[PDB]
């Protein structure tokens, strides 16, 4: 069993001791790995956040921790002396490892075929549902001509269950003889999907 790794949360050089006890106080940590063209370029950004204010950040493009706001002024010096070398190393030991050893065999290989159906309500709606990953191309055709004006589209909707949907609408008016088709291309499909509506 190969292993997903994580970005370690660095501690303030504190020691603390103050107590808060309808008031609440929130702290966040975010360890972010950005990948482009495989692992050919990786950018690691770690964020330390008090309530909603990011006050301290490591950015591998920058090379060290920097205070993002005044609230982080004292934090940066301490994090650079205590955690800089191991944070730098995590670009390889956490970001690259996770992509190459765990995303390549799971997330990046995952494929789910879109379902495609056409409904009226005028507006023809091509409902393109339950696909993964996000890359998709949906086009409306009105008797053989790809439509441009009159087409609108929802944002790509994240279902939260590792599928997406998008609804692609064509403003039109029904007439006895016309055919309409939505064409869908997605990396999961052996051949593009066409659904006709009359």
């Amino acid at each position: 069993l190969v292993e997903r790794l994580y970005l370690v949360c660095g501690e303030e050089g504190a020691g603390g001791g103050s107590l808060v006890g309808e008031r609440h106080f929130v702290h966040q940590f975010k360890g972010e790995c950005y990948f482009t063209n495989g692992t050919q370029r990786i950018r690691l950004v770690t964020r330390y956040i008090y309530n909603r204010e990011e006050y301290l950040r490591f950015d591998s493009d920058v090379g060290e921790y920097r205070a993002v706001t005044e609230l982080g002024r004292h934090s940066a010096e301490y994090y650079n002396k205590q955690y800089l070398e191991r944070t730098r190393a995590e670009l390889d030991t956490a970001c690259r490892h996770n992509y190459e050893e765990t995303e390549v065999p799971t997330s990046l290989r995952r494929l789910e075929q879109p379902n495609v159906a056409i409904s009226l309500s005028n507006t023809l709606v091509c409902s393109v549902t339950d696909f993964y990953p996000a890359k998709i191309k949906v086009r409306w055709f009105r008797n053989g001509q790809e439509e441009t004006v009159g087409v609108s589209s929802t944002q790509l909707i994240r279902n939260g269950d590792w599928t997406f949907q998008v609804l692609v609408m064509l403003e039109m008016t029904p007439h006895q003889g016309e055919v309409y088709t939505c064409h869908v291309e997605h990396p999961s499909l052996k051949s593009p999907i066409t659904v006709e509506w009359r």
Partner: protein
């Protein structure tokens, strides 16, 4: 803001006081990989197939929570005890697949602008509580450091579908009852 082909969150952590509430999750391309059940010390995969050959040692999330508890104590004092601002969450409910009479489907309640990350999302049908089979995500991070969460209710579309998603949050004077418009 930062453009990339893919982004992993290998370390999403939140902790709050008082109440001692927090979570630890991983995400890939904005979808939840797992959360760590902190008290049971175990990784809970968003989809069960994720952990069949890959492991995540739950100690990693325990370390991050411990560090964030410590970090919160420092920053709370440094801020002169500036409290979080309660936001008003926003709910939308929509179906997973096109609605067709008699054909199995899922209603999704998408709740955004969540802060702090403590909330109750529940479902009603014909204004009666429905809890069987309901699933909800962890708190998923937003770029502005608020959260969103989704709840899911399996259903069979019918003649008079009356479904509501109820959201309770400290940032709301009254619970929002978000009606699904079929």
């Amino acid at each position: 803001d930062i453009e990339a082909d893919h982004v992993g969150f290998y370390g999403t952590t939140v902790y709050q006081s008082p109440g001692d509430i927090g979570q630890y999750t991983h995400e890939f391309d904005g979808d939840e990989l797992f959360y760590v059940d902190l008290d049971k010390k175990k990784t809970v995969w968003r989809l069960p197939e994720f952990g069949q050959l890959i492991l995540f040692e739950p100690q990693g999330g325990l370390q991050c929570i411990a560090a964030e508890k410590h970090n919160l104590g420092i920053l709370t004092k440094r801020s002169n005890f500036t409290p979080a601002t309660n936001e008003a969450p926003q709910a939308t409910v929509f179906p997973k697949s096109p609605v067709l009479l008699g054909q199995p489907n899922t209603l999704i309640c998408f709740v955004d602008n969540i802060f702090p990350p403590v909330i109750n999302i529940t479902w009603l049908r014909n204004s009666k509580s429905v809890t069987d089979g309901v699933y909800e995500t962890s708190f998923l991070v937003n770029r502005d450091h608020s959260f969103h969460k989704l709840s899911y209710l399996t259903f069979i579309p019918s003649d008079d579908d009356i479904y509501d998603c109820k959201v309770e949050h400290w940032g709301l004077e009254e619970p929002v009852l978000k009606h699904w418009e079929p």
